[PDB]
Amino acid sequence: EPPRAETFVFLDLEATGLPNMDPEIAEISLFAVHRSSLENPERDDSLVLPRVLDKLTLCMCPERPFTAKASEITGLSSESLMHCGKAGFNGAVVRTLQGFLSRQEGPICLVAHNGFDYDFPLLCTELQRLGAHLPQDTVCLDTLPALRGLDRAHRKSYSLASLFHRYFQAEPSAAHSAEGDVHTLLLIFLHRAPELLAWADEQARSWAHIEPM
Amino acid sequence: EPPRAETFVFLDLEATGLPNMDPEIAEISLFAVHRSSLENPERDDSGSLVLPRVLDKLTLCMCPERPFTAKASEITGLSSESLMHCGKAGFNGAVVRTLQGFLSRQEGPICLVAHNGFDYDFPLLCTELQRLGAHLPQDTVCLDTLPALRGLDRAHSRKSYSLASLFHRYFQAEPSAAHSAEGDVHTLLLIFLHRAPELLAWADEQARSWAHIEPMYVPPDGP
Ligand SMILES: Nc1ccn([C@H]2C[C@H](O)[C@@H](COP(=O)(O)O)O2)c(=O)n1
Ligand SMILES: Nc1ccn([C@H]2C[C@H](O)[C@@H](COP(=O)(O)O)O2)c(=O)n1
Ligand SMILES: [Ca+2]
Ligand SMILES: [Ca+2]
Ligand SMILES: [Ca+2]
Ligand SMILES: [Mg+2]
Ligand SMILES: [Mg+2]
Ligand SMILES: [Mg+2]
Ligand SMILES: [Mg+2]
């Protein structure tokens, strides 16, 4: 039913708190990977990331300061980002993100762990706030209900750390940083690429159907 | 003479060959680091250098109009066909919008940093930008760490000053993901951090205006 995506843009967000705290994006990271790299993963002797990998990471000072929980987790604070001269989520962010996505062969499928409940509606809120739009044929995939569902067909924790520890028998790094989490998500995805690509070809939700937080 | 830069944007290019073949950018990577992260390089409890937490990054692959040389392709692990297979267009408007937006997110003035930048990266980037009629912010300056580190060793008185040699000399280990844009910038940033006080001082004194950078070659045409 959804359009067959050609590029999968894995993304992750660090923000100032949980959804009902009206959180602001402090960090966003995106790894763009063409479908063909996911269909036929490279392995040295273990998974290695695709050679052709467009990447974007941007830090931003939120207008609302962090929570203690969020700050210690992400290793970021409103003061820290200001000190490094980062402005908030503004037109410059939109122009860079839109440019980055236009560099990708469409249709695009955004991928995020627990995206339906957090990343997607938060990004939508920020984009809508600036009256910005994504390409019309853009869809999105939440690997959280997707992985749970795929396992039903065959109690376990489905946190990003639990999954990585389960598939690769090791600890992820650098956790709770936007770029680090996308890196972790991409490896997890690669480990289950055929099933997840299949999931996306059917269950991927239209970005237009994502409502602001 | 030069302005005091607030953001140091470390950049690396992968391209189809050496200057005399009129190479084209196939990959670009930029790490943006605020001066404060360089003035006081943060170090873990083990005392070893770690990359700044607040670190904007941009890596983009693109299919050049002309293909790679045997060497260039073998080095970078890139090829025209592989870039095409991953549906990457060439250095176009979308690259400029992304690049210019990325730089606009940085507190200026900006100092571009590249290893062998004067002889390769800066002229090549200038050629590609002129092709699309794109400009960087006027107050932008640039730093070549190759003559900088040579000059510093000459000052605080043969050795190779290649990226690999310097990383080996300063960190005594093999650099990971060598000859990839993002990998080489990562290597460059660590080298810079190893001697940040000196290089910052060098930048404040001898950083060249980007406006003085000449194109590696006059591009054929368009758009
Ligand atoms: N128990 C938690 C965990 C995370 N967060 C916030 C901080 C993070 O910026 C964001 C989740 O990002 P991530 O899952 O990548 O750590 O939500 C929160 O408010 N409470
Ligand atoms: N002996 C060399 C050194 C460099 N290059 C080209 C390939 C790279 O795309 C670009 C930058 O080199 P490097 O990856 O080593 O930084 O110059 C080349 O063709 N032959
Ligand atoms: Ca703006
Ligand atoms: Ca274990
Ligand atoms: Ca070199
Ligand atoms: Mg997240
Ligand atoms: Mg995260
Ligand atoms: Mg180089
Ligand atoms: Mg390089």
Author numbering:
A (entry chain B): 3 to 47, 50 to 158, 167 to 225
B (entry chain A): 3 to 159, 167 to 232
Give passages from the manuscript.
The three prime repair exonuclease 2 (TREX2) is an essential 3′-to-5′ exonuclease that functions in cell proliferation, genome integrity and skin homeostasis maintenance. The exonuclease activity of TREX2 is responsible for removing the 3′-mismatched sequence of duplex DNA and is associated with cell proliferation and DNA repair. In this study, we present four new crystal structures: apo-TREX2, TREX2 in complex with two different dsDNA substrates, and TREX2 in complex with a processed dsDNA product.
In order to understand the non-processive mechanism of TREX2 in DNA processing, we determined mTREX2–product complex. In the complex, the input substrate DNA is degraded into single nucleotides by mTREX2 during crystallization. MgA and MgB adopt a classic hexa-coordination pattern and a non-canonical penta-coordination pattern, respectively. The orientation of magnesium ions, dCMP and active site residues are consistent with the structures of other DEDDh exonuclease in complex with products, such as TREX1–product complex. According to the structural comparison of the substrate complex, mTREX2-Y-shaped DNA complex, the scissile phosphate and general base are shifted; specifically, the scissile phosphate is moved into the narrow groove in the active site. Hence, the product (dCMP) cannot be released from the narrow groove in the active site and the cleaved DNA substrate cannot be further processed by TREX2. Therefore, the cleaved DNA substrate should be released before the product; in the other words, the DNA substrate cannot be continuously processed by TREX2. In addition, the structure of mTREX2–product complex demonstrates the narrow groove in the active site limits the product releasing (nucleoside monophosphate); thus, the cleaved DNA substrate should be released before the product, which provides the structural evidence for the non-processive property of TREX2.
